[PDB]
Design a protein around this ligand. Sequence first.
Ligand code: FU5
Length: 221
Amino acid sequence: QPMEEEEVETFAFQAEIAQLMSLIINTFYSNKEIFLRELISNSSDALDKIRYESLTDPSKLDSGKELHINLIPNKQDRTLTIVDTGIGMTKADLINNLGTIAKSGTKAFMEALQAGADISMIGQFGVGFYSAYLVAEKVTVITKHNDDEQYAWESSAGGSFTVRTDTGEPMGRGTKVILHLKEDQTEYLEERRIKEIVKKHSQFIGYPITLFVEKELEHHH
Ligand SMILES: Cc1cc(-c2c(Cl)cccc2OCCCC(F)(F)F)nc(N)n1
């Protein structure tokens, strides 16, 4: 008789990834806006990937031809969501690429920071995604790859993350990164702030970037 039932898996982050997340989410930096550049950069790469695949197999765009990036601030939920129609991830991709297997860059980046590097260089070590925790207390990733189910990944950086099937609104293809913002980081929900950050840092992204300001209408939250 339950409306829904689903299995939820909990995985431990690999140690260096856990270490990186703790350093990022706890440390003061004065240039936190760079997180948006890193996430938009990931979307652009994911969009490059599906586009490349579609070169030799057009039917890979049966799940949607438009290649673009949406930014969706929601003040009532205090969330900023970055959505793309890129290649998406399989369940194994989520588990493997978002916490259980460390690349050398995870330790390299922390080494670099010790050697005097700047947090803004995180993208050069292939781990820019985790810069999301500069501004977010929790991150939810919803993703759909061709021929696969839609999955939801989530972590509040406790040393572990969860994976489960996402039964909400079906995406055609791609990835949503939902940032549940820290209380003092709500500036990044403001249209003015989002525009100036995109203009400054993402000028050379070769895909449409579109803002959708989300508001839940009264009595209809
Ligand atoms: C498929 C996908 C994957 C990611 C992504 C996430 Cl959520 C966490 C950590 C690394 C990532 O990509 C690395 C690059 C993945 C590549 F090469 F497929 F683009 N982001 C988006 N928007 N889309």
